[PDB]
Amino acid sequence: STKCVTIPTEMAMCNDVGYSEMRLPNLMGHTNMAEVVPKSAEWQNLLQTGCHPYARTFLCSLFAPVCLDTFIQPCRSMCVAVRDSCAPVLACHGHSWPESLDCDRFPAGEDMCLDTLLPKPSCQGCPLIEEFFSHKTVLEAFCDNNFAVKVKLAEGPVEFIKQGLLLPYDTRTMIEQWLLINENCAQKLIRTRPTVYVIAGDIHHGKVKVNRIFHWQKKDSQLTLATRRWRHHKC
């Protein structure tokens, strides 16, 4: 038996994707909502990393499929595109792309399947949290990297030192995505109490890479001096 049931608000994967009802069993083989919801919740961290714009579409088509008796599967090429961008993020959390989503289970081509007609943080080594630095070294970091920001983590409102093309909202989100991906690094940084850092990095093509992190301590002089002189500094 197959039934059409409303997507409950507690299913964060799919509670705001445009349609409101789903098929049981779903394409994952879950038979009831007590199974669907916690299994879907395993993906909540991943979906917040922004690793692929179609990640949520892809997963909802499997977890909350539309109410036909025919299964409309994602096309293999959609699985491959989402896997290739998001499996590196899973690996950064100690997880792997599940065998239940190996892309060979989905049809090749584009008939009867779901297909497609900003800079991304990557999993990287943790930057040293620098503490005994001179303002000269900070300024050289500002010259080299194409952005630098002052942020407070606990992650409050961000002050640009070297802004470039960056928009404030986008930069905030890029930082939070970097912290969510790089869980091991976040844990060293967000050692409560709330802490202030200067973060210098590079938005290459088209990835974000954090290269330098400077701890802004209570009675700092060197980051103060560096941020004051940056405006008039010559590289």
Author numbering: 24 to 140, 151 to 187, 201 to 281
Can you provide the manuscript's text about this entry?
Sizzled (Szl) is both a secreted frizzled related protein (sFRP) and a naturally occurring inhibitor of the zinc metalloproteinase bone morphogenetic protein-1 (BMP-1), a key regulator of extracellular matrix assembly and growth factor activation. Bone morphogenetic protein-1 (BMP-1, EC 3.4.24.19) is a secreted multidomain Zn-metallopeptidase of the astacin M12A subfamily which plays a key role in extracellular matrix (ECM) deposition, growth factor activation and the generation of animal form.
Here we present a new crystal structure for Szl which differs from that previously reported by a large scale (90°) hinge rotation between its cysteine-rich and netrin-like domains. The final refined model includes two chains (A and B) containing 235 and 241 amino acids, respectively. The structural fold of Szl is stabilized by eight disulphide bonds (seven intra-domain formed by cysteines 27–90, 37–83, 74–109, 98–136, 102–126, 159–231, 176–281 and one inter-domain formed by cysteines 115–156). No electron density was observed for the linker (residues 138–150) connecting the CRD to the NTR domain, probably due to high flexibility. In contrast, the NTR domain displays mixed β-α-β topology, consisting of seven β-strands (β3–β9), flanked by helices α5–α8. Instead, there was a rotation about the long axis of one domain with respect to the other of approximately 90°, pivoting around the inter-domain disulphide bridge.
